[PDB]
Design a binder for this molecule. Structure first.
Ligand SMILES: OC[C@@H]1[C@@H](O)[C@H](O)[C@H](O)c2nccn21
Ligand SMILES: OC[C@@H]1[C@@H](O)[C@H](O)[C@H](O)c2nccn21
Ligand SMILES: [Ca+2]
Ligand SMILES: [Ca+2]
Ligand SMILES: [Ca+2]
Ligand SMILES: [Ca+2]
Ligand SMILES: [Ca+2]
Length: 1371
């Protein structure tokens, strides 16, 4: 007998042996329980409709208004045909004598209702006996059901409703048909689970509905799970005789569907293909496993959560492993689910059994790369939302097929398939799209055509050419498609150019040129066989995008040529025609290059990169080589095929962005680099052949949202490609030197989207890791501009800075102000560490040098300002209104609700937004244990996607987050990406290990069918998450050169570093299940810590993980956790310490402070916490005095914010003085010859001789030249009196004495030591105050006294004492 079997459930395939039929056991008992297959419906007397197994109408209106809709029991779904007449054929399971039927009219357009019809009956389906005629029928209402009786005792297997006249329209429609046999059943029995050949998915996020995976047919299953507990049904499909061999693979495609309004019932995933063997055993009893390791049985399919609902899923199982030598007697479909009630529905297509499968071979990393990942994905549900980008790493152009030539939605894997269910290309495009949301720009289009008409038609629909994915090769360096009609197109990239081979079958062959829309030009010089063009195409968010120029040449004479018309694209549509009658002329080659400078430059770009000697194959090899140099930085052992696809495709995505936007205007020997600026104003107007944009010397790179890429991609560069990273960074620093700012979202200029200015942290982070090959000085300037200087541009700097730099938080007056705020504090963390590093560098030629020290202090403080956005009443980060009040209170708050404060997520997902200081974050939650409790709750509460909040309706990010099914964890999007690693701060690293492994395992699947990710990939970010996590470490603390340890994915990984050394990562015992770190070594030596320095791996290292299947305590020690700014000893403090703040804040209004100016101006404008108010003081030489009415203030720093007015009015030299009486002043700080290069720009100064004073005076000794002196704001940055903290501890100690948590000599000794400490503090004896607090701690740990304190009390009092020491040390 045979070893192979295949069904696509087509017309041409074998029909099912049984339909809707349950398999029976050895005893003849149905293998089903608690199931109802019947569709829910309004039943008529003797309703028989459930025996209809097939309905076929003469014409249809796919995707939604097809014959299928006639028996689905929903009046809301209809069949429609664009015809005045038609016939519907109903095939029944068994012959029945129909004696009654009902038609139901549809939703609208009464004229389309049937009016005259005949019902026929048949035995064979070709010879028809009339059984009822109706004429002149009327349906008064929409959704109206008419009932019809007839005499008939003849059992028939087919019924035809022949609709001979409708109600006058040229279109016909009907919502529902029901048939009846006239026999009463007062109690309709449950029917068997449905299993029948149908049209495929009735709903799908990402695929074409009502077609198969391939072809027009599939197997459809559905039913109702009635039971509270287990329900199942194993149904037989096909009678076969198939011998299984050791190598036999079973594969299939399954598309489970949601049957509920809420898209929360996952029942449809509890399904698999099953086999009945001749020996009386079933595949579901053997330990067959899929490509993910999941049992190939229904229960394990559903429990393991690898099947996505409303999407197609590829499944593959080597049943040979477990069933070699058995014979398959029947193929089954099985549903089996432990819990309900619920309901399910889905499709299976392409059940294949292959006795001798051929495995794919791979010669090098690039052979693993599928550039189609992220294309069975759209705006309803993303599996990456990429496009098939062919390019060199970081190339100047992308090249790509498009199935939608008007759109930034460039290529659909399945969604836009033809009536024959094949994809259609409409063009090959030059592209610069960073994402579909940002949109495409600078595009240009060609399409081959075998048209013989006088003129090739340039209409998108009519020129489109169908193809099969099996005939398409899609790689970074090579794309190839063979179309159904015999044409082949192949392309390969250069940096600025590309080569295409068009191979034809006919005598007359054409290339059609076109564009996304009419905003460009085409010039065809037929005589020299050249194309010339320009493109102004640019999406809404393509801010600063300039004109692109195109040049192209052919290897064959062009015989006919010209402009085309009729598409409303007359500026861009034309063609060239070639004589390809002779065999050696059947392939035509086009060489094509692009420029943002000029047509002349496009020409020069082409000559530089495609010499006369270059061939298609030579260029392809050059591109393959450039990709392998990137892909082969990482080499792993033990990986499956699926893992290597994911790994190497991830590395491709990582290096696809960002992109060169500069050109070589000199020669290959002597390069001269220049770019057209999307950053500053155009020099002048464009011409057809030359750009008007400013031509700027040097390099630049583009296409990057820092809100995405800072998390993973940028640190990936700094680790994997240190040297190139610096060239990339400098190309972004260029944006500062040119346009004044570094882009927040470069697309290619300053596009306005997403919160934060994370170039700050990304580039700071890179520098501190030893990527020093860029203009750090300018970078720094751009960072402080982001951090200190209000932006006039919508697309640059930090929104809400007007108030936020003074308030310590960003208020709800800025959209998603919380989001701006939290990312602000992380950026400040990086700016601060860089300032420290530049201080230590000591470059005295840096004009800014004297200022680094101060900036470190000020910025490290700002990094801790997260406290100002932590709402203590709900224990979540939360917005504040302008007046200071929390947005939410316990009564109204819901952490499940998306939006408002929370960009593209909910409060849950922003609960942990403090990667720069985990201990500080833990403290807000009560300590490490409190942090862990919060995370646990996060990971065990399911995201339902039902809470859109401010988004109004469902956005795709919500569906994706829902389908992660890791509690609330939104791995589908960037703002959650740090969360799994936060367990390293809580001292539970095993939970990080668990979550990271689930993420790597389940959320990067489906590559083979154009899926591959759990949501939008975003310019390398989702990819680098996987690459870094799989190595076993992760840059959690962006802005400081070290990683948090997770666990490696592979038995071995090597990172070949550019300096010739290796990072080897050994985990010989690694496996799907062995996910937990048991112990760890670095360089032969046992390693205890869950952090590792970049400086320890960058010069090579050997890392050994002992992996096992059970959690361990490795890395849970108090000094083994990730360290923070906040000391570990403070864990669990009852105090709420603050970093530097402006101690004048809010005093004036509460009358606890006031201000006087030497000229009697309103000095309140200098302390109102807004740079939108300034004071002009009528003197070159004014004085401001701030008076604290409630005692001495410990001020460490102060800030001056330049005004909006001219720079000449600025302070320039000054003295800050302190006093206690107002008569006698001490000199605290002196500055000379200061400047404020920007407007509304804050500068911070470290007071040379600080102390505690009740009165502060700023005495301006010199200004910048004008007759007046103007400022916007002043601040006195200091700390609260430590005394108030001591007080809070006495208070707490009293609470414990009253509860008897603290008694006897322990109470007394603690009291004494604290009091002696306090007394020393008040006499300015800092060292002695600390020493007595150390005594306090010794008491707490006195062995003789443990029966006098509870653990609760000992714990918090310890933490408090240590917190006090910290408060003291900084005082
Ligand atoms: O083109 C027919 C379409 C229908 O498919 C749709 O259901 C609706 O009834 C309608 N109103 C006007 C036109 N149409
Ligand atoms: O594509 C640009 C931005 C991204 O940078 C970001 O990841 C965000 O999730 C998003 N959703 C739609 C568009 N975008
Ligand atoms: Ca099929
Ligand atoms: Ca219907
Ligand atoms: Ca995103
Ligand atoms: Ca203030
Ligand atoms: Ca002000």
């Amino acid at each position: 007998s045979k070893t192979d079997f295949f069904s696509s459930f087509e017309k041409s395939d074998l029909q099912l042996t049984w339909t809707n039929t349950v398999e029976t056991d050895a005893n003849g008992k149905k293998m089903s329980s608690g199931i109802d297959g019947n569709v829910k419906r309004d039943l008529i007397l003797g309703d028989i409709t459930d025996k209809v197994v097939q309905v076929t109408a003469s014409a249809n209106n796919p995707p939604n208004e097809i014959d299928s809709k006639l028996i689905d029991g929903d009046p809301t779904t209809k069949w429609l045909a664009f015809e005045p007449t038609a016939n519907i054929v109903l095939k029944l399971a068994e012959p029945v004598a129909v004696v009654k039927y009902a038609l139901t009219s549809a939703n609208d357009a009464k004229g389309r209702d049937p009016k005259n019809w005949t019902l026929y009956g048949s035995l064979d389906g070709t010879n028809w006996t009339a059984v009822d005629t109706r004429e002149g029928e009327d349906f008064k209402d929409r959704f109206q059901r008419n009932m019809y009786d007839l005499k008939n005792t003849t059992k028939y297997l087919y019924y035809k409703l022949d609709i001979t006249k409708n109600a006058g329209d040229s279109i016909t429609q009907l919502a529902e048909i029901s048939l009846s046999d006239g026999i009463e059943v007062p109690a309709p029995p449950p029917g068997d689970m449905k299993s029948l050949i149908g049209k495929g998915p009735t709903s799908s996020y990402t695929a074409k509905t009502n077609v198969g995976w391939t072809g027009l047919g599939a197997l459809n299953y559905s039913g109702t799970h009635l039971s509270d507990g287990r329900a199942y049904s194993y149904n037989k499909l096909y009678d076969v005789d198939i011998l299984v061999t050791p190598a036999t693979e079973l594969s299939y495609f399954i598309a489970p569907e949601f049957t509920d309004k809420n898209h929360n019932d996952y029942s449809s995933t509890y399904v698999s293909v099953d086999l009945a063997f001749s020996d009386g055993t079933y595949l579901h009893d053997l330990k067959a496993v899929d490509q993910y390791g999941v049992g190939l049985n229904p229960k394990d399919q559903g429990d393991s959560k690898y099947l996505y609902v409303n999407q197609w899923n590829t499944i593959k199982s080597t049943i040979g492993s477990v069933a070699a030598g058995k014979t398959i007697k029947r193929i089954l479909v099985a549903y089996d689910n432990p819990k309900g009630p619920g309901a399910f529905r889905g499709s299976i297509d392409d059940i294949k059994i292959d006795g001798k499968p051929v495995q794919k071979a791979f010669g090098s990393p690039i052979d693993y790369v599928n550039i189609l990942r992220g294309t069975q994905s759209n705006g309803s549900f993303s599996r990456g939302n990429n496009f098939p980008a062919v390019a060199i790493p970081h190339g100047f152009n992308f090249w790509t097929p498009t199935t939608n030539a008007g759109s930034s939605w460039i290529y659909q894997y399945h969604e836009s398939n033809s009536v024959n269910n094949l994809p259609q290309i409409q063009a090959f495009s030059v592209s610069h799209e960073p994402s579909p949301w940002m949109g495409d720009r600078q595009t240009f289009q060609v399409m081959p055509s075998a048209s013989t008409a006088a003129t090739p038609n340039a209409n998108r629909d009519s020129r489109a050419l169908e193809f099969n994915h099996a005939n398409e090769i899609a790689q970074p360096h090579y794309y190839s498609v063979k179309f159904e009609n015999g044409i082949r197109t192949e392309m390969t990239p250069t940096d600025h150019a590309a080569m295409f081979k068009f191979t034809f079958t006919g005598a007359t062959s054409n290339l059609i040129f076109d564009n996304v829309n009419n905003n460009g030009g085409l010039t065809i010089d037929a005589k020299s066989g050249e194309i010339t063009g320009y493109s102004d195409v640019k999406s809404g968010l393509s801010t600063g995008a300039t004109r692109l120029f195109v040049y192209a040449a052919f290897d064959k004479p062009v015989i006919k040529s010209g402009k085309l018309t009729g598409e409303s694209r007359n500026n861009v549509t034309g063609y060239v025609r070639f004589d390809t009658s002779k065999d050696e002329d059947k392939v035509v080659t086009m060489k094509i290059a692009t420029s943002l400078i000029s047509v002349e430059q496009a020409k020069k770009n082409l000559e530089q990169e495609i010499g006369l000697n270059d061939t298609f194959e030579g260029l392809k090899e050059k591109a393959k080589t450039e990709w392998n140099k990137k892909l082969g930085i990482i080499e792993v052992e033990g990986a499956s095929e699926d893992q290597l696809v994911t790994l190497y495709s991830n590395l491709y995505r990582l290096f696809l962005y960002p992109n060169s936007a500069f050109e070589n205007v000199g020669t290959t020997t002597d390069p001269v680099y220049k770019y057209a600026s999307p950053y500053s104003a155009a020099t002048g107007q464009d011409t057809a052949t030359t750009t008007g944009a400013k031509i700027v010397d040097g390099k630049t790179y583009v296409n990057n949202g820092f809100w995405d890429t800072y998390r993973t991609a940028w640190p990936a560069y700094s680790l994997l490609t240190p040297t190139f990273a610096g060239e990339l960074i400098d190309g972004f620093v260029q944006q500062y030197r040119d346009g004044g700012w570094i882009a927040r979202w470069s697309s290619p200029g300053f596009a306005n989207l997403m919160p934060g200015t994370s170039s700050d942290v990304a580039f700071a982070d890179a520098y501190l890791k030893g990527v020093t090959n860029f203009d750090v000085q300018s970078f720094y300037q751009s960072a402080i501009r982001n951090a200190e200087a209000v932006s006039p541009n919508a697309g640059t700097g930090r929104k809400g800075l007007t108030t936020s730099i003074f308030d310590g938080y960003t208020n709800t007056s800025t959209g998603e102000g919380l989001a701006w705020a939290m990312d602000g504090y992380i950026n400040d963390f990086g700016i601060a560490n860089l300032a420290k590093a530049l201080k230590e560098k000591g470059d005295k030629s840096d004009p800014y040098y004297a200022n680094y020290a101060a900036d470190y202090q000020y910025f490290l403080n700002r990094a801790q300002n997260y406290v100002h956005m932590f709402n203590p009443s709900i224990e979540f980060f939360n917005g504040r209104t302008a007046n200071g009040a929390w947005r939410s209170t316990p009564d109204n708050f819901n952490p499940a609700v998306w939006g408002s404060d929370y960009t593209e997520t909910n409060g849950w997902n922003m609960a942990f937004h403090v990667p720069q200081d985990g201990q500080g974050l833990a403290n807000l939650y009560g300590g490490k244990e409190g942090l862990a409790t919060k995370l646990d709750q996060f990971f065990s509460t399911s995201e339902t996607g039902l809470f859109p909040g401010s988004y109004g309706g469902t956005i795709h990010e919500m569906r994706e987050a829902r389908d992660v099914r890791m509690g609330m964890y939104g791995h589908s999007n960037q703002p959650s990406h740090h969360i799994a690693y936060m367990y390293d701060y809580a001292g539970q690293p095993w939970k990080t290990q668990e979550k990271v492994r689930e993420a790597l395992n389940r959320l990067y699947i489906g590559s083979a069918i154009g899926q591959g990710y759990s949501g939008d990939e975003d310019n390398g970010e989702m990819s680098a998450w996987y690459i870094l996590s799989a190595m076993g470490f992760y840059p959690l603390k962006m802005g400081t050169p070290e990683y948090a340890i997770g666990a490696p994915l592979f038995k071995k990984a090597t990172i070949h570093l550019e300096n010739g050394k290796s990072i080897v990562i050994n985990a010989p015992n690694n496996s799907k299940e062995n996910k937990y770190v048991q112990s760890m070594k670095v360089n032969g030596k046992a390693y205890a810590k869950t952090s590792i320095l970049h400086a320890d791996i960058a010069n090579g290292a050997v890392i050994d993980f002992e992996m096992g299947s059970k959690p361990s305590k490795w890395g849970s020690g108090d000094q083994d956790i990730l360290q923070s700014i906040t000391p570990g000893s403070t864990d669990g403090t009852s105090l709420s310490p603050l970093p530097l703040r402006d101690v004048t804040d809010r005093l004036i209004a509460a009358e606890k402070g006031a201000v006087t100016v030497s000229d009697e101006g309103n000095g309140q404008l200098l302390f109102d916490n807004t740079s939108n108010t300034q004071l002009s003081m009528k003197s070159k030489t004014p004085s401001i005095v701030y008076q604290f009415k409630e005692g001495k203030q410990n001020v460490k720093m102060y800030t001056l914010t330049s005004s909006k007015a001219s720079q000449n009015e600025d302070p320039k030299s000054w003295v800050l003085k302190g006093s206690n009486d107002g008569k006698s002043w001490s000199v605290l700080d002196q500055r000379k010859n200061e400047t404020f290069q920007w407007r509304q720009y804050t500068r911070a100064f470290t007071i040379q001789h600080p102390g505690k004073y009740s009165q502060y005076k700023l005495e301006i000794t010199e200004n910048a030249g004008a007759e007046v002196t103007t400022l916007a704001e002043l601040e006195l940055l200091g700390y609260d009196d430590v005394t108030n903290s001591y007080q809070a501890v006495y208070e707490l100690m009293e609470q414990f004495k009253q509860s008897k948590d603290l008694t006897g000599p322990m109470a007394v000794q603690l009291n004494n030591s604290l009091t002696t400490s306090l007394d020393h503090f008040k006499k300015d004896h800092k060292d002695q105050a600390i020493k007595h607090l150390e005594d306090f701690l010794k008491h707490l740990n006195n062995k003789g006294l443990q029966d006098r304190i509870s653990s609760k009390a000992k714990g918090v009092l310890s933490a408090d004492a240590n917190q006090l020491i910290v408060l003291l040390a900084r005082d």
